[PDB]
Write a protein that binds this ligand. Structure first.
Ligand SMILES: O=C(O)C(=O)Nc1sc2c(c1C(=O)O)CCNC2
Ligand SMILES: [Cl-]
Ligand SMILES: [Cl-]
Ligand SMILES: [Cl-]
Ligand SMILES: [Cl-]
Ligand SMILES: [Cl-]
Length: 282
């Protein structure tokens, strides 16, 4: 609406880089003391991407509670997300332990395991039904039950079993497999359709623990996904639906995890997605 004209003004004035750098400058700065402890060095994929102490997810088993993951609690929009890095070969057990302990129903993956020939995320789920994964450190078993592969994303039904209690849970794995190789997409259509499929699944509902969202570092594409989702919620909730200020929402989110949205293009793409998505919900 008005937001759509604000978008055009930024585009003609070429102000995207300027707006994005204002966000980085105004962003919250809270301590990440635990993330930076010597014993956690090999639980961080990127030394420059750490959870704040105040919002980090704590693992419940006995020896080291640390995982590189943040609870993002959007109060007005009434939605919570856990944003986390793509797990490492040694933190896959921690990752599924977090999913169990936080009672998550869905996992949203926004990257491929390898991109431009670099390892961005461990193969943390089973690719074959008959080859289940056992995480001996956290005593969990994970089985591929079935998968629905579409052109722009794949949804997998996973069975997560607490080998301690033999309780099992169905986890939905929403894998957006087609984020553009460089930059962002020309159109937000495919990303928006993926978002709506996650919503339709029930994985985001408050009856469940927060959805777990990750990319490689858990801040760039992950930030895009949560920012768009939250802004679209706010546009549907408010009686003044164009009072939604995307920059303000992003700064609110950045109180809970650093660095959400990593490029001016991703900020532009987020605006595009919220604009076109708000029209879809109409
Ligand atoms: O996957 C994403 O969208 C994301 O946040 N990626 C990020 S953020 C980020 C890095 C990466 C990476 O993948 O190399 C490396 C250096 N520090 C910041
Ligand atoms: Cl230490
Ligand atoms: Cl992959
Ligand atoms: Cl929803
Ligand atoms: Cl706002
Ligand atoms: Cl940043």
């Amino acid at each position: 609406m008005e937001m759509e004209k604000e978008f055009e003004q930024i585009d003609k004035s070429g102000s995207w880089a300027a707006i994005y750098q204002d966000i980085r400058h105004e962003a919250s700065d809270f301590p990440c003391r635990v993330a930076k402890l010597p014993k956690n060095k090999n639980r961080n994929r990127y030394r420059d991407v750490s959870p704040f102490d105040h919002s980090r997810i704590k693992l419940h088993q006995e020896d080291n509670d640390y995982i590189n993951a943040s609870l993002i609690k959007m109060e007005e929009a009434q939605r919570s997300y856990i944003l986390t890095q793509g797990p490492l070969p040694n933190t896959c057990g921690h990752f599924w332990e977090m999913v169990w302990e936080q009672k998550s129903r869905g996992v949203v993956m926004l990257n491929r395991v390898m991109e431009k020939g670099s390892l961005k995320c461990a193969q943390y789920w089973p690719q074959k039904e008959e080859k289940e994964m056992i995480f001996e450190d956290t005593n969990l078993k994970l089985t591929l039950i079935s998968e629905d592969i579409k052109s722009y994303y794949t949804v997998r039904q996973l069975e997560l079993e607490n080998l301690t209690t033999q309780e099992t849970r169905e986890i939905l794995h929403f894998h957006y497999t087609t984020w553009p190789d460089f930059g962002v997409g020309e159109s937000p259509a495919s990303f928006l359709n993926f978002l709506f499929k996650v919503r339709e699944s029930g994985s985001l509902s408050p009856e469940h623990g927060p959805v777990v969202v990750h990319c490689s570092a858990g801040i760039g594409r992950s930030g895009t996904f949560c920012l768009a989702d939250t802004c679209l919620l706010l546009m549907d909730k408010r009686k003044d639906p164009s009072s939604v200020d995307i920059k303000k929402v992003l700064l609110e989110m950045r109180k809970f995890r650093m660095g959400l949205i990593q490029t001016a293009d991703q900020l532009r793409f987020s605006y595009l997605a919220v604009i076109e998505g708000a029209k879809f919900i109409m």
